[PDB]
């Protein structure tokens, strides 16, 4: 993550971070996110350190690629902002998605049709989506979280400092996580990046789908 | 069985406050325990406001209001349906009902 | 006020071990505290413990390894005999394979097993297991 030479951040990833707005936080400050906030700027906004973000992204990607079963990692999304990101991420890597109304009878109830126990769980946000945390507490299941400076941290193994209020930031973070896990698995070689499109994971509001449908052929 | 987080009033560091009097009753309930109301009422609410305005000599004359307040004992307030009881799971809701009109 | 600094120190390190902190703070210091922490580190329940020195009141920083369960203090200052410490260790210690009884003898602050093999005894400080 930071012990080697090639694993450090590239030059355009900083540009993508500053374009997507992955540096500004909320208004308050939690007592577990104190080691990721460096200094409080004006307008009541706290700044996360981007080196810490890239480092924990590398650690989480290593933890994801550590298992040898690609269909045993599960991703969870609840709100309507990040929906296509986890779906196309599971299409690319091989994960299993649950987007929209995570049913509580999955990891505990062993007679239901929707009964699948995973090895790693990746949540979009603990505060907005806390039901898989409580059910992951009842079985041997670690969690991966994309947490903000105002999101409480509980039952979290690896925490990713994030700005999870904009869809572009979450989509670009998912894009870099997918890029890192496919480079670490051995599909895309490290010497050449596959950066063809980061807008595969970008979500837009229902105005822009009609606008782009009328603009395109 | 203890009922509430507090003792049911606004006494927390004093011991004794001045007593007040109810309006429809005459109970000597303390001030920090009773129920207050800052009601605003016009002289004419919606009955004959146009009849009052068209009978006014002065052009562009606005009717005044009546800024008076009343004090209620607890039995008097619950008999007049001012306060209402609720359940235990929502009993820790100090927030007032919303105002629209 | 404070009149038993050793009981407060042992209660503080017990509470901080039960929560799971690694480095703790003790506001007083004395001879009895530093010899008790050396016999702690010699029998192997803590790690490298530090001490700050000033001209007013020293403080002690203690490293933890989690190898302790509970560490209490006999108050008030009782006295025992050689035909008496077995009665204490039967009704106080959780077992005889572990758990130590410390006591102040003529040779200094020391635990009960080498007091048994050296055949001397005296006032009792505290206990830990």
């Amino acid at each position: 993550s930071g012990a080697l030479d090639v694993l450090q951040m590239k030059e355009e990833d900083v540009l993508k971070f500053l374009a997507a707005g992955t540096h500004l936080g909320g208004t308050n400050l939690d007592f577990q996110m104190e080691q990721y906030i460096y200094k409080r700027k004006s307008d009541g906004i706290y700044i996360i350190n981007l080196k810490r973000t890239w480092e924990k992204l590398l650690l989480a990607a290593r933890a994801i690629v550590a298992i040898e079963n690609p269909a045993d990692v599960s991703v969870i999304s609840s709100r309507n902002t990040g929906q296509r990101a986890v779906l196309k991420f599971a299409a690319a890597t091989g994960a299993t998605p649950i987007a929209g109304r995570f049913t509580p009878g999955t990891f505990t109830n062993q007679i239901q049709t929707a009964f699948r126990e995973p090895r790693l769980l990746v949540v979009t946000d603990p505060r907005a989506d806390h039901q898989p945390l409580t059910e992951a507490s009842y079985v041997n299941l670690p969690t991966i979280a994309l947490c903000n400076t105002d999101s409480p941290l509980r039952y979290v193994d690896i925490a990713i400092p994030c700005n999870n209020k904009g869809a572009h930031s979450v989509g670009l973070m998912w894009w870099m996580l997918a890029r890192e896990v496919l480079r670490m698995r051995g599909t895309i070689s490290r010497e050449h990046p596959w950066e063809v499109m980061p807008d595969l994971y970008f979500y837009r509001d229902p105005e822009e789908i009609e606008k782009e449908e009328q603009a395109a052929a | 069985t203890k009922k509430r987080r507090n003792n049911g009033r606004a006494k927390k560091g004093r011991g004794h406050v001045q007593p007040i009097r109810c309006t429809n009753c005459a109970r000597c309930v303390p001030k920090d325990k009773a129920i207050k109301k800052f009601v605003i009422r016009n002289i004419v609410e919606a009955a004959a406001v146009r009849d009052i305005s068209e009978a006014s000599v002065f052009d562009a004359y606005v009717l005044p209001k009546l800024y008076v307040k009343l004090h209620y004992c607890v039995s008097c307030a619950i008999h007049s349906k001012v306060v209402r009881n609720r359940s235990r799971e929502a009993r820790k809701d100090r927030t007032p009902p919303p105002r629209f009109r | 006020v404070r009149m038993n600094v050793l009981a407060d120190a042992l209660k503080s390190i017990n509470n901080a071990e039960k929560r799971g902190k690694r480095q703790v703070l003790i506001r007083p210091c004395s001879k009895v505290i530093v010899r008790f922490l050396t016999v702690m580190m010699k029998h192997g329940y803590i790690g490298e413990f530090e001490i700050i020195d000033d001209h007013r009141a020293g403080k002690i920083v203690v490293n933890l390894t989690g190898r302790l369960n509970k560490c209490g203090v006999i108050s008030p200052r009782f006295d025992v005999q050689l035909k008496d410490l077995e009665k204490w260790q039967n009704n106080l210690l959780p077992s005889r394979q572990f758990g130590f009884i410390v006591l102040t003898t003529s040779a200094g602050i020391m635990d009960h097993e080498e007091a048994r093999r050296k055949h001397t005894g005296g006032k009792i400080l505290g206990f830990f297991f």
Partner: protein, 83 residues
Amino acid sequence: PLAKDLLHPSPEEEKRKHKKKRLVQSPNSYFMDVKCPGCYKITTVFSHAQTVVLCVGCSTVLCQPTGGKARLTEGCSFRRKQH
């Protein structure tokens, strides 16, 4: 924090804490010296005076007693001394 190291933190950590909660025990007030703009003799004064003090030569009063640090007379040059 779990393994919070209380041996040597950043000096901002001892700055924000109290004067007695600091692990190395030292106060916050200091000594200072300040002169009169129309004089030669310069004298030293503590940061919290608690009595009114005038400069030597009985020319013009220098400090004023406040609840906190003593406020200085307007138009006076000073610098903090340390050792």
